[PDB]
């Protein structure tokens with residue numbers, strides 16, 4: 001049937017990009033409590049790294065993002081933590097929670113929580129992240 | 135590209151003009167002088183992208199009107215036709231710009247909100263806070279839209295979850311990013327059901343966008359106020375405003391909403407188009423024959439009054455019983471000249487299994503269906519070239535069934551109007567299991583020709599990637615192009631491809647190396663369906 005992991009991946013990477021944008025705009029503009037924006041910069045960079053390599057489908061031939069081979073090797077190194085979708089979902093939600101203290105990053109938080117939800121959905125289905133071997 | 139370059143350049147120039155123009159409509163004039171000091175330069179950087187979003191949002195809905203654009207194209211120079219076939223590439227471009235301008239707008243309104251709250255809680259320069267004092271009392275209009283004294287960052291979160299522009303901004307930002315993140319090529323192609331359903335948050339996006347600017351919180355000094363309040367004299371007398379004759383307290387109003395004036399027409403057009411599509415769903419299509427081919431493919435041969443097709447075209451079929459809401463697209467696999475029109479449907483999933491089960495193919499009445507219309511780009515040109523080299527890979531053979539079946543009819547009907555004389559067909563497939571119906575067509579066209587003593591017409595090879603008659607491995611396109619080049623000298627040949635992109639580059643490269651520069655020389659025009 002449908003593979004929610006693909007849409008969860010695409011949503012999570014953009015949530016990370018928006019978190020980076022909101023954190024950078026909080027840091028540069030010296031928004032009061034800019035340290036939450038600084039957290040958003042580091043959390044968004046980490047989300048983009050972790051969510052850049054798309055996984056391999058159960059059926060068919062998948063597309064790979066540009067320069068994903070390097071990222072896939074790193075994500076493979078962490079064993080089950082990247083693989084499990086329960087771990088990925090709880091990681092995304094926990095990283096989203098402190099970013100919700102600033103308006104510039106509230107949009108990131110919501111988007112990351114929407115993604116962690118789709119990861120949760122994929123986790124219930126039995127889906128996991130198997131790497132795309134070359 | 136005439137039309138493509140023209141439309142893209144005009145659209146980009148209009149965006150640049152609107153941005154520059156509305157940047158200076160909100161930066162130069164003295165009407166917005168005091169706002170530009172509470173908000174700084176982040177006023178115009180919020181309001182020029184808003185004008186660009188006004189224009190872009192009207193544009194996004196127009197090249198996706200499926201039934202209205204087809205009605206226009208039925209009456210609307212093949213060089214031209216293919217440029218206007220890039221309506222879904224223009225939709226994507228407009229949507230990406232909607233994202234870009236929205237991002238600029240959003241970031242600017244984040245500075246605005248910060249600075250507005252900050253001044254309200256005595257955490258800014260003296261002048262902005264003094265300006266924030268307006269609107270507390272009677273007979274004075276605020277300039278600062280933050281009115282509760284809640285310190286940042288909680289003041290910013292309050293304004294978003296209480297201001298109408300903030301609540302609608304958050305809602306349609308979520309409903310814009312979700313559309314975008316659920317519209318990557320992988321979602322659009324591997325999981326179409328997620329793309330289509332989530333793409334309907336557009337109704338929410340436009341509904342939030344229409345009521346987005348109702349509050350008029352971004353306010354400028356009114357014209358009558360400017361007439362009595364000479365700004366250059368009154369700026370430094372803020373501490374005594376209203377108590378000196380020269381400087382009455384300035385009055386600020388908000389601009390009336392403008393976006394509804396833009397998006398009213400396209401939403402109406404899209405609603406009329408959806409009603410036209412519903413009307414096509416109500417129209418009669420009698421399913422004369424259902425043939426169950428091997429490996430779960432059902433050929434549905436059906437008649438609908440007034441259906442005219444062209445080779446290569448596809449239709450959308452809805453079966454109300456399987457899904458009231460969805461139309462699934464299928465290529466017309468029958469000749470244009472036949473009374474009936476056919477589609478060959480391979481059972482791969484939920485709707486298709488539902489049609490199969492409903493039809494009764496499963497068991498030892500037939501469901502009501504509704505065909506949307508010949509859509510797609512025709513491949514009528516196949517007939518014009520004297521020789522052709524159709525190459526179909528995998529599930530891409532399907533378009534060629536209509537074409538191949540049609541050539542026979544034109545040969546029988548006239549035998550002179552068919553300029554075509556030779557067809558070389560290459561089927562590159564992993565296996566022939568699900569497309570066995572096609573092998574039978576290819577055998578027949580040849581058999582009919584052989585009976586009619588023109589055994590020369592149809593030469594075909596099936597090449598099995600997994601590893602006349604079947605062969606193993608892909609064709610050596612280096613060899614094939616030269617061989618046909620030897621047999622047919624001084625002639626133009628069209629290599630029509632309906633297969634993967636890698637194959638498409640391979641053939642185009644092969645075409646050009648093979649095609650002779652000289653006017654006498656064989657040319658190998660390449661068209662990719």
Ligand SMILES: Cc1cc2nc3c(=O)[nH]c(=O)nc-3n(C[C@H](O)[C@H](O)[C@H](O)COP(=O)(O)OP(=O)(O)OC[C@H]3O[C@@H](n4cnc5c(N)ncnc54)[C@H](O)[C@@H]3O)c2cc1C
Pocket residue numbers: 322323324325326327448461462463464465466478479480481482483484485486487532
């Ligand atoms: C121009 C065009 C011509 C086509 N011609 C044919 C044809 O001749 N024969 C044929 O069997 N199929 C054809 N298809 C696709 C066919 O409509 C799908 O196989 C069918 O919709 C599957 O529905 P399902 O219930 O099995 O969906 P699922 O099994 O859930 O989907 C399986 C695959 O079908 C795609 N798909 C699902 N719904 C749609 C939709 N509404 N539009 C497009 N793709 C969809 C998905 O991207 C997915 O990869 C064509 C599609 C297009 C765009």
Ligand code: HEM
Pocket residue numbers: 194195198199200222225226229230232313314317318322333336339404
């Ligand atoms: C940003 C990336 C976007 C992409 C890639 C995209 C892509 C597409 C595609 C391919 C279609 C054709 C649907 C089909 O084949 O059946 C489509 C239809 C449509 N899109 Fe978009 N789109 C995007 C954004 C938007 C936006 C921002 C809006 C408006 C808010 C929008 C509104 C529509 C509408 C109304 C349709 C027609 C739906 C129908 O007729 O069934 N899209 N889009």
Ligand code: HEM
Pocket residue numbers: 184185187188191236239240243244299300302303304306307310343346347348349350351352388389390391392393394
């Ligand atoms: C995400 C946070 C957003 C905030 C805080 C925000 C805030 C605002 C505000 C304060 C206004 C002026 C309202 C008024 O004068 O009454 C406005 C206008 C506007 N915004 Fe937004 N906005 C956001 C997102 C968006 C998005 C995603 C779009 C996408 C189309 C958009 C399009 C517009 C438009 C077109 C206007 C002009 C309204 C008009 O002239 O009638 N905004 N926005």
Ligand SMILES: *[C@@H]1O[C@H](CO)[C@@H](O[C@@H]2O[C@H](CO)[C@@H](O[C@@H]3O[C@H](CO)[C@@H](O)[C@H](O)[C@@H]3O)[C@H](O)[C@H]2NC(C)=O)[C@H](O)[C@H]1NC(C)=O
Pocket residue numbers: 273
């Ligand atoms: C709040 O603002 C309103 C309107 O700006 C003020 O009401 C207006 O006050 C002027 C000054 O007295 C009134 O003009 C007078 O009109 C009478 C006839 O009604 C005329 O005999 C006088 O010579 C003078 O021209 C004006 O009518 C009045 N407007 C209304 C609608 O009553 C109001 O005073 C302000 N409130 C406070 C507390 O200052």
Ligand SMILES: *[C@@H]1O[C@H](CO)[C@@H](O)[C@H](O)[C@H]1NC(C)=O
Pocket residue numbers: 256
């Ligand atoms: C605002 O803060 C400044 C800085 O100390 C102070 O001088 C001024 O009196 C304050 N105004 C109010 C209304 O609290």
Ligand SMILES: *[C@@H]1O[C@H](CO)[C@@H](O)[C@H](O)[C@H]1NC(C)=O
Pocket residue numbers: 364365366367
């Ligand atoms: C504002 O005051 C200046 C200074 O006297 C004067 O030159 C200008 O004409 C005045 N403008 C208006 C609109 O009254």
